[PDB]
């Protein structure tokens, strides 16, 4: 984040000290500077690594979900009057890759909700401004089965009531991990199968645990239905704040295939170029 070191002038050298020659077998990166191999002038460095900080790298709102809801009528079976979305950053790739640069992370989160609505037909009248309810459902809490069941009382569940046309809604969340850091990767299982029990029992998905269980968001339109159908989409933008990260990893090189590290397609990411072609 802070200023880089200056460059010191270097003249000709004739000595038994050989910074150029090293041994990478040790696993240590040679900390050479230009003045070690070539003659250098004095440069008072003014560049800084301020935008390379882990905070800056993640200080952007990244779309992570597009939740679709409808306001048509209870009778219509093809219209989804409410939508439940499991909270995760793995429905999108860009933030997922930036995060999976690191094994562990710990950060507060900022959720911004951009709601856009539209008509689906013209010859059924018009609609009044809609209010959307976004109810956070932590794991274990009752999940709505209908758009107007008791669960939406939100006596305890945090809930956001957004008026259409208002600026995108926004909330902040502290670090809510049950562990001391978020696990981008979990090399293990939630169950250990025990000798004796049937192959059906004890079988758990690889890499899946309750560390990444954060509940879901239930989104509905609070208004009663107008004689015409209205389709709305809530876009969720996640911004990490106060980011700490641990154990850097090589970034994803091939397309993601599911919530894990599985790959199936695009296994040839590199193009063809001659060895002696510039």
């Amino acid at each position: 984040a802070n200023n880089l070191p200056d460059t010191q002038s270097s003249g000709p050298a004739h000595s038994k000290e050989t910074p150029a020659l090293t041994a990478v077998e040790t696993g240590a990166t040679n900390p050479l500077v230009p003045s070690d191999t070539v003659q250098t002038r004095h440069v008072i460095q003014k560049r800084t690594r301020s935008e390379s900080t882990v905070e800056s790298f993640f200080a952007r709102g990244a779309c992570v979900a597009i939740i679709e809801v409808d306001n048509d009528a209870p009778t219509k079976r093809a219209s989804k009057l409410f939508s439940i979305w499991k909270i995760t950053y793995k429905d999108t790739v860009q933030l997922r890759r930036k995060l999976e640069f690191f094994t562990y992370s710990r950060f507060d989160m900022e959720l911004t909700f951009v709601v856009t609505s539209n008509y689906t037909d013209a010859n059924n009248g018009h609609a009044l401004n809609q209010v959307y309810q976004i109810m956070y459902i932590p794991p274990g809490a009752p999940i709505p089965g209908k758009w107007n069941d008791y669960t939406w009382q939100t006596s305890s569940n945090p809930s956001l009531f957004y008026t259409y046309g208002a600026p995108p809604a926004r909330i902040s969340v502290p670090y809510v991990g049950i562990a001391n850091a978020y696990s981008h990767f979990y090399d293990g299982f939630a169950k250990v199968p025990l000798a004796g029990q049937a192959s059906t029992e004890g079988d758990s998905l690889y890499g899946a645990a309750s560390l990444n269980d954060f509940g879901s968001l239930a989104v509905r339109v609070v208004n009663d239905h107008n004689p015409t159908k209205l389709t709305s989409k809530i876009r969720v933008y996640m911004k990490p704040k106060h980011v700490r990260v641990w154990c850097p990893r090589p970034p994803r090189a091939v397309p993601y295939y599911g919530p894990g590290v599985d790959y199936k397609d695009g296994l040839a990411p590199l193009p063809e170029k001659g060895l002696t072609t510039y």
Binding site: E25, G27, G188, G207, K241, A253, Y256
Partner: protein, 277 residues
């Protein structure tokens, strides 16, 4: 200058070298052609501090009984070898009193000293990258995500091998449910050439015969279940293929010796007997 004032309670709402000897317990390792030794992330293994202890019951620390070098099965390095992987503590689950404490307790924690040994003459060629990967998740071999079963994910001291190319398991009736780690993708959809971001050492047969990695206990928790979670993964890849005097068919052994360090176990119960392959 600018002025900042917080209008909320919760802070979340605020704006953003060659000759070496290693003695552990009753085990000793001497090396003369070593390329030094790497301490992963510069952190030496340590015991849980009272400021970070989650479990309340008294831990057990077997010390020398379990903090000692165990040698795994030797693998063979050929010209056609693509690489090998092991999971820790999984690779040591059948190793003396360490495995006993591992299976008798619900929670376990340990760092490691990994010593990879590969001696060859001065007329041999080849380089091995030895990488310690925290949370070394590997890709499966089926269209079903995260479908690898426990038995294959925990091979034991034999570990597994990397593959040259990805093969899809189409057997619907009896799926293999095994890993398919591709060597150049490092088994996790990442280019192997970038794997050097992990703690590592290169065994260049012209320079060194061995590699030593001191892995601290790395995890999002102070202590976890050793039977559920593999803290570390040791991946060995041929960076430069093995070659010798044009004779061909040459193969040299690679031996792996791992010593757990600062072992702590909590939650004593009846022993865990995991389902076998």
């Amino acid at each position: 200058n600018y002025t900042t004032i917080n209008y909320y309670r919760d802070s979340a709402s605020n704006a953003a070298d060659r000759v070496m000897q290693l003695t552990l317990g009753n085990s000793t390792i001497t090396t003369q052609e070593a390329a030094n030794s790497v301490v992963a992330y510069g952190r030496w293994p340590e015991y849980i501090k009272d400021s970070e202890a989650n479990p309340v019951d008294q831990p057990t620390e077997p010390a020398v009984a379990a903090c000692r070098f165990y040698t795994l099965d030797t693998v063979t390095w050929r010209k056609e070898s693509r690489g090998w992987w092991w999971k820790l503590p999984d690779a040591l689950k059948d190793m003396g009193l360490f495995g006993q404490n591992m299976f008798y307790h619900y929670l376990g924690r340990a760092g490691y000293t990994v010593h990879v040994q590969c001696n060859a003459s001065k007329f041999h060629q080849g380089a091995l990258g030895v990488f310690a990967v925290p949370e070394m998740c590997l890709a499966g071999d089926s269209t079903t995500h995260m479908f690898t079963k426990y038995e294959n994910a925990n091979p034991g001291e034999k570990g597994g091998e990397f593959k040259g190319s990805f093969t899809l398991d189409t057997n619907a009736t009896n799926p293999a449910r095994n890993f398919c780690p591709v060597d150049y993708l490092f088994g996790s959809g990442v280019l192997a050439g970038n794997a050097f971001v992990y703690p590592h050492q290169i065994i260049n047969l012209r320079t060194n015969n061995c590699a030593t990695l001191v892995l601290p206990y790395v995890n999002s928790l102070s202590i976890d279940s050793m039977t559920k979670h593999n803290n570390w993964g040791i991946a060995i890849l041929p960076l430069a293929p093995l070659d010798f005097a044009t004779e061909s068919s040459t193969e040299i052994p690679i031996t792996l010796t791992i010593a757990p360090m600062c072992c702590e176990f909590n939650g004593l119960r009846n022993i865990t007997v995991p389902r076998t392959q």
